[PDB]
């Protein structure tokens, strides 16, 4: 069912006016349209925003909207960028939301930043490799994002290239999207217990998800860092050891557990003999030391990755080299 009449003007809860354009993909399958500020002109293919629209009873859009309202207000992001001395922060900006009735059905909508391409497309176009430079630069910026969200009570649980989108105007800035199944692991400073949460059904994306998720417990901070670890290997090598067995979750879990216990064997498996990037192993060893409720030392993880950039004769110059 069509949610909008194209070119209609929708008014958010803050009474800000927006105009709806044509559909656009942002790496997922939701109902997403181009959007801009209300003006006399039509919404173009270069629109700076999108509007996401779902039935009011859709659980994921409610979860996502609450994340964006709590953690992604423009001024809150800019304050963090200033105080932490960052170039940018890859958390999409929240511009407004509301309720829209059409044909007796109730819809929720949310206005957010419009982005360019997802990284999965670019990865596939590059024969399923990213360079060591690229992986390290992506990962440093993902660590900034994870630190931010974690400090705002949320974990993502589903970091992967299809959820990483480039700034529409700047292809050296990567953003993490899709908070529909994000989890508030620390509401009002109280950490969730080491157990399943009946409110949560999602287990992540099987090839990348954490051992915690495989064990049926709610995601926490160490899980997000573990997920990033698996992504880095996938990106560097084109493969993960368990990728032919993704229909068998117990096999995937068993493999991940074994390779966490023996990280040298993972490096031997995934990289040419005696030629493994040392920062990846050090990253995984550091994450391995985290307990379920423990606050990561993000600056230590970043330093590990910076040692990698030094080792290849480079520096953190913010260049993704895509």
Swiss-Prot record:
Protein name in the entry: Serine/threonine-protein kinase VRK1
Segment of the intact protein contained: 20 to 341 of 396
Nucleotide-binding is among the record's keywords: yes
Compartments, as annotated in UniProt: Nucleus; Cytoplasm; Nucleus, Cajal body
Documented effect of changing residue 70 to Q: In HMNR10; uncertain significance; increased kinase activity resulting in increased autophosphorylation and phosphorylation of COIL, H3, H2AX, TP53, JUN and TP53BP1; does not affect protein stability
UniProt-reported outcome of changing residue 194 to H: Found in a patient with distal sensory and motor neuropathy; likely pathogenic; severely reduced kinase activity resulting in severely decreased phosphorylation of COIL, H3, H2AX, TP53 and TP53BP1; the orthologous mouse mutation results in impaired Cajal bodies assembly
Known tissue expression: Widely expressed. Highly expressed in fetal liver, testis and thymus.
Gene designation per UniProt: VRK1
Annotated source species: Homo sapiens (Human)
GO BP field: Cajal body organization; cell division; chromatin remodeling; DNA damage response; Golgi disassembly; mitotic nuclear membrane disassembly; neuron projection development; positive regulation of protein localization to chromatin
